[PDB]
C-alpha cells in the first residue's frame, strides 16, 4: 500500500510518500541524482571507477606479509592507514542515529529515546504486502525449516582462523555490556543506556548497583577469597540482583555487574579477571596518589579499564578476527584532524549479526574433562576446582567453531538460534541484499553466489524462491567464507563499521579526555597504551599463563 514498500531509492537515498500511490527520493548528498538516486554525478563516476571491492582490499590485507611488516614498522605509514580504516568505516554509520523498530522515518522520539536499539535500515512498513516489502511470497519460510536445513550442525566445523575459547568467551563477555535486550518491551529495546563500552558489565548499569558492588575503600570493588584466590563477592554480602537457578547455594551466588554472568563459568572467568584488574589499578593509582580518596580512585580506575578494553579489542580481538597482516592501532589522536562524532547508538543489526551461535563447541574441554552443556552451564564449582589458571590454559587450546559456511549451529542451542531468525522478522528487517547495498556491497544474484556451493543454495531457493528476499541473519551463517576465514563478506562489512564506531565513539577517545591527567597521570595512561590480552591475563592470573585468541 505504501509507495515506499519496494525500497525504490538507491545509494542511501531516502523514500518519502507524496500521495497514496507515488514516492519521491531525497538524493541529498548521496553522490547520485534522478528519480531513484541511480544517476551518478561526475565525481561519483570517477570514485566508483577507482574504488576497489571489499574482497579485493581484504586480499591485500591478508597477503604480502613481508610488505606489511615494513609498513607496520614505519609509524607515520601505520598511522595513515589506521586513520583511513577508522574514517572510511565510520562514514557508513548514521551518527546522530536515525531509525528504530517503530520509526521508518526520522523523528524526535527515535532520536531521543535511548531504550531503543537504533536501526541502520528502517523497518518494512506494516501495510506492505510482503514481509520484505513487495518481493517474495506472502509469508517468509518456516524458520524451523531454515534452521534445520542449512544452519544446524552435523559435524563440528572448527574455525580455520584458529579462534579459541578464550576468544569465544571474550566476545560473549565484552558484547554483553551493550547487547542487553529488554524483552519486557521487545527485541528492539535495550537496557544498556550507555550504548557502548562503559563496562557496566563490571560496575553495574545503575548507581545503586555500582555502590553495592564497591568496597568504598581505595576505590576497589568488593571481593571474597576462595582457596587463597580473589573472586567476586556474594549476593548475600552485596544484596546485588543476580540471575541464578534455584539450586545454586548462597556460597556460589557471585555478584557481578551483569546479572547473567554467573550462569556460564566462561563469563565468570572474565568477570573475575576484570575485577582483579580493577583492584590492581587501584593499588597502582594509590601508590601514585596517596592523597586521593576512594571515589577518585574508583572513577579513575574505571576510565583506565575502559581504555584497556578498547585497546585490547582493537589490537588483539579485532586484530585476530580481521586476519590482516597490518598491525591495527588504538590511537585516538588519529581522528583529531578528521570529522568524527564522539557518540554511539547501538544498532539492532549489530546485535543480530553478533549472534555467533556456531562459535560454540560441542563440549567445553578443561584439563582432560569434556563437559557437556548440561554439565558446564550454571556450574561455577568447575571453575573453582580447576582454577582460573587452568581455565585460561585449556580455553587457549580449545578450538572454536566457524561462524560462516553453514551447518555449524550446535543442536543444543537450536531454540535460541531459531529465535534470532524470528526476532529479525518481528522487527521487520529488510532483506540481506538491502543491507548489502546499504553497506556498499553488491547484491547477491543467486543463492549459489551467496553460499559458494550447490546443496545449501538449492535448499534456500526452495524455501525463499527469490534471492532478494533472503534474510540477513541466516545468510550471515551460510555465507561463503573468505578463504580459510571465520566470516563471509557481509559479516565483516557490516560488523566492522558498527564495531569501530562503538570503540572510537567513546568519550575517552575525544581530545578533551585523551590526555594523561584523565587517567591519573603518565603511569595510568601507560596502563592503557600497553594493555593486551596477554598482559591482562599475566597480571591477574596466577602463574601468568600464555594466552591469545588463536590456538597454537
Amino acid at each position: 500500500a505504501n509507495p515506499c514498500c519496494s525500497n525504490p531509492c538507491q545509494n542511501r537515498g531516502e523514500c518519502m510518500s507524496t500521495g497514496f500511490d507515488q514516492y519521491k527520493c531525497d538524493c541529498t548528498r548521496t553522490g547520485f541524482y534522478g528519480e531513484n538516486c541511480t544517476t551518478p554525478e561526475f565525481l561519483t563516476r570517477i570514485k566508483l571507477l577507482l574504488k576497489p571491492t571489499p574482497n579485493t582490499v581484504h586480499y591485500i590485507l591478508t597477503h604480502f606479509k613481508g610488505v606489511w611488516n615494513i609498513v607496520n614498522n614505519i609509524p607515520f605509514l601505520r598511522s595513515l592507514i589506521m586513520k583511513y580504516v577508522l574514517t572510511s568505516r565510520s562514514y557508513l554509520i548514521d551518527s546522530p542515529p536515525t531509525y528504530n523498530v517503530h520509526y521508518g522515518y526520522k523523528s524526535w522520539e527515535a532520536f531521543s529515546n535511548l531504550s531503543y536499539y537504533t536501526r541502520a535500515l528502517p523497518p518494512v512498513a506494516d501495510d506492505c504486502p510482503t514481509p520484505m516489502g513487495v518481493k517474495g511470497n506472502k509469508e517468509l519460510p518456516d524458520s524451523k525449516e531454515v534452521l534445520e536445513k542449512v544452519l544446524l550442525r552435523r559435524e563440528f566445523i572448527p574455525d580455520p582462523q584458529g579462534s579459541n575459547m578464550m576468544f569465544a568467551f571474550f566476545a560473549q563477555h565484552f558484547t554483553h555490556q551493550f547487547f542487553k535486550t529488554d524483552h519486557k518491551r521487545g527485541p528492539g529495546f535495550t537496557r544498556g543506556l550507555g550504548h557502548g563500552v562503559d563496562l557496566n558489565h563490571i560496575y553495574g548499569e545503575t548507581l545503586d548497583r555500582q555502590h553495592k558492588l564497591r568496597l568504598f575503600k581505595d576505590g576497589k570493588l568488593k571481593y571474597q577469597v576462595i582457596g587463597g584466590e580473589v573472586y567476586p563477592p556474594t549476593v548475600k554480602d552485596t544484596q546485588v540482583e543476580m540471575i541464578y537457578p534455584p539450586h545454586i547455594p548462597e556460597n556460589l551466588q557471585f555478584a557481578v555487574g551483569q546479572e547473567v554472568f554467573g550462569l556460564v563459568p566462561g563469563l565468570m572467568m572474565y568477570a573475575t579477571i576484570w575485577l582483579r584488574e580493577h583492584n590492581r589499578v587501584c593499588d597502582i593509582l594509590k601508590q601514585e596518589h596517596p592523597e586521593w580518596g576512594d571515589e577518585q580512585l574508583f572513577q579513575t580506575s574505571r576510565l583506565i579499564l575502559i581504555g584497556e578494553t578498547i585497546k585490547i579489542v582493537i589490537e588483539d580481538y579485532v586484530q585476530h578476527l580481521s586476519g590482516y597482516h597490518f598491525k591495527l592501532k588504538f590511537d585516538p589522536e588519529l581522528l583529531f584532524n578528521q570529522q568524527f562524532q564522539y557518540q554511539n547508538r547501538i544498532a539492532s543489526e549489530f546485535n543480530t549479526l553478533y549472534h555467533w551461535h556456531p562459535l560454540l563447541p560441542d563440549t567445553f574441554n578443561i584439563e582432560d574433562q569434556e563437559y557437556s552443556f548440561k554439565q558446564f552451564l550454571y556450574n561455577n564449582s568447575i571453575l573453582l576446582e580447576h582454577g582460573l589458571t587452568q581455565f585460561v590454559e585449556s580455553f587457549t587450546r580449545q578450538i572454536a567453531g566457524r561462524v560462516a559456511g553453514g551447518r555449524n549451529v550446535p543442536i543444543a542451542v537450536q531454540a535460541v538460534a531459531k529465535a534470532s531468525i524470528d526476532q529479525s522478522r518481528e522487527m521487520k528487517y529488510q532483506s540481506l541484499n538491502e543491507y548489502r547495498k546499504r553497506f556498499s556491497l553488491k547484491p547477491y544474484t543467486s543463492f549459489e553466489e551467496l553460499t559458494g556451493e550447490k546443496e545449501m543454495a538449492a535448499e534456500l531457493k526452495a524455501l525463499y524462491s527469490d534471492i532478494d528476499v533472503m534474510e540477513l541473519y541466516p545468510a550471515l551463517l551460510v555465507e561463503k567464507p573468505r578463504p580459510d576465514a571465520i566470516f563471509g563478506e557481509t559479516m565483516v562489512e557490516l560488523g566492522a563499521p558498527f564495531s569501530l564506531k562503538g570503540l572510537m565513539g567513546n568519550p575517552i577517545c575525544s581530545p578533551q579526555y585523551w590526555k594523561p591527567s584523565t587517567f591519573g597521570g603518565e603511569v595510568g595512561f601507560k596502563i592503557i597504551n600497553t594493555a593486551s590480552i596477554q598482559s591482562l591475563i599475566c597480571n591477574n592470573v596466577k602463574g601468568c599463563p600464555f594466552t591469545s585468541f588463536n590456538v597454537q
Partner: nanobody
Amino acid sequence: QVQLQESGGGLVQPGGSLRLSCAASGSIFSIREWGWYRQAPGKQRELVATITSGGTTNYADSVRGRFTISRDNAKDTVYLQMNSLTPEDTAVYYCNAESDGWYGLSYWGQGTQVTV
C-alpha cells in the same frame, strides 16, 4: 529470576470457557518467550501456546483457533483464553518462560487444574 503463578483453572462442562492467567515477576527483561503447557493424567507434557517478547504466537494443532495466548506487558501477565472446552482438554496447565541466550534459564509455574 522470574516467578510464575497460574490461576483461573477450575471445573467446567463441555463447551464452556475459561481464561487462565499467569502472573510473572522478577527478571522480566530476560524472557524472550512465554508459553502455556498442559499435562493430562498419565500422558506427556505437551505444548499448548507460546508467544515471544516480539509477539510471535504459535499454537498446537489441537488447540489452534479456540485457544488464544496474549501478554499484558503493563501487568506482566500472560493470558490463555480457552473456549469450546472439550473433555480432552482436561489437564494441569503450566505457565512457562524462556530466557534469552543459549545459557538462559527455563522457568515453570505451579500449574492450575482444568477439569472439563
